[PDB]
């Protein structure tokens, strides 16, 4: 059993005919093995029954209330000051609530693209993720859709983390580039040449592989013969008939069909990943946003909780259950209680879980969940001491 003195507010839990003293309802509930509620009772009944030591877990949340929506959104935001300034000061904020996005904060179309960096190493941000450049060569990376005139602006360890890699912003590279083609193609048209073909809708641009020919996009064919024009001026145009019979394959060239747009950190401030899954998705989706300030409401904007023990600042809407799988280094699934104020505390297993009244934990990504500053684990072992 369980109760609350009426006179104090205080907790005692009922353990083998001796009272104890609990600090919270959270390890009450975990002691009792189910989400209790406490009896009320007059503080002279409490001298009825012998009274034994105070159990419990002191830093654990008082309870644990979960937010109404069953839809698992998790942000992570990037604001940086002084973007142009020898010293940029960056801020970080966790998002698990809703956004409203607009047009000064929306995902990055797929023609737009950020250049950051991070321990003195530089990356292309796009909507997949982030892609290692090197600055070097301008006149390559121009042809990579990088102007000269492109500063990069520093990211965050969270936002480092976050950001999937998802291979150089570059060419991929050709195996055998010079060599003769064995396709059937002109002699002219070595590996790694480009040619094209007219269409209805225009030219259609190809390079030659070892093992067939592959579409690319203008900018692709461009940006290969800045590297290398295999002595060609422009691009021999050949006749269909000649090319329908050659395998197709494909260039994974990272380059959009757009020339690039490259955004000014200045300008759009707030670099953000968000991550969402509903309730039955097979798989989470998320994307990259860039814009003026955080993707939230007007008054959310006042709302924010800073972890002064932490990195971030936290935007929340009422407590979170969340279940996360992450490779430390091997495979591991975990679960977390994320109170009001944005603090994690760990939840070892299901009975755990559900002993706290803790249904279904929604899916979450580690990468973010885990910038929240971590309390005691949840156990009734550590409970019990
Ligand atoms: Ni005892
Ligand atoms: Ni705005
Ligand atoms: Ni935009
Ligand atoms: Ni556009």
């Known amino acids: 059993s369980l109760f609350t003195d009426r006179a104090t507010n205080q907790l005692y839990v009922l353990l083998s005919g001796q009272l104890h003293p609990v600090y919270n309802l959270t390890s009450a509930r975990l002691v009792l093995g189910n989400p209790a509620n406490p009896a009320t009772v007059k503080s002279s009944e409490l001298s009825k029954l012998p009274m034994g030591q105070?159990?419990?877990?002191?830093?654990?949340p008082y309870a644990t209330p979960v937010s109404a929506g069953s839809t698992s959104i998790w942000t992570l935001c990037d604001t940086v000051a002084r973007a142009d300034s020898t010293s940029p000061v960056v801020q970080t904020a966790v998002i698990a609530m809703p956004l409203e996005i607009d047009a000064s904060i929306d995902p990055l179309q797929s023609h737009e693209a950020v250049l950051v960096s991070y321990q003195g190493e530089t990356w292309i941000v796009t909507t997949k993720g982030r892609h290692a450049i090197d600055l070097t060569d301008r006149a390559l990376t121009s042809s990579m859709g990088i102007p000269v005139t492109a500063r990069p602006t520093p990211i965050s360890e969270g936002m480092f983390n976050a950001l999937p890699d998802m291979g150089?912003?570059?060419?991929?590279?050709?195996?055998?580039?010079?060599?003769?083609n064995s396709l059937g193609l002109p002699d002219d048209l070595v590996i790694g040449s480009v040619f094209q073909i007219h269409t209805d809708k225009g030219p259609q641009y190809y390079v030659v592989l070892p093992?067939?020919?592959?579409?690319?996009?203008?900018?692709?064919?461009?940006?290969?013969?800045?590297?290398?024009?295999?002595?060609?001026?422009?691009?021999?145009?050949?006749?269909p008939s000649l090319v329908v019979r050659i395998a197709e394959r494909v260039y994974p060239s990272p380059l959009p069909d757009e020339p690039l747009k490259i955004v000014s950190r200045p300008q759009d401030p707030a670099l953000c990943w968000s991550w969402q899954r509903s309730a039955g998705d097979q798989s989470p989706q998320?994307?990259?946003?860039?814009?003026?300030?955080?993707?939230?409401?007007?008054?959310?904007?006042?709302?924010?909780?800073?972890?002064?023990?932490?990195?971030?600042?936290?935007?929340?809407?009422?407590?979170?259950?969340?279940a996360l799988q992450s490779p430390d280094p091997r495979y591991t699934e975990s679960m977390y209680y994320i109170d009001p104020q944005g603090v994690r505390?760990?939840?070892?297993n299901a009975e755990t879980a559900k002993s706290l009244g803790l249904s279904s934990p929604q899916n979450a990504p580690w990468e973010?969940?885990?910038?929240?500053?971590?309390?005691?684990?949840?156990?009734?072992?550590?409970?019990?001491?």
Do not use: E
Request: proline share 11%.
């Open 54 to 60: 105070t159990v419990g877990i002191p830093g654990a």
């Open 168 to 180: 150089p912003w570059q060419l991929p590279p050709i195996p055998a580039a010079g060599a003769p």
């Open 211 to 239: 093992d067939g020919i592959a579409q690319v996009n203008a900018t692709t064919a461009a940006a290969l013969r800045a590297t290398q024009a295999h002595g060609l001026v422009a691009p021999p145009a050949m006749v």
């Open 286 to 322: 998320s994307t990259v946003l860039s814009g003026r300030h955080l993707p939230i409401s007007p008054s959310a904007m006042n709302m924010g909780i800073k972890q002064i023990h932490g990195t971030a600042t936290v935007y929340l809407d009422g407590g979170k259950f969340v």
């Open 345 to 348: 505390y760990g939840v070892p």
């Open 368 to 385: 973010i969940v885990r910038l929240l500053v971590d309390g005691p684990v949840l156990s009734k072992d550590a409970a019990l001491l």
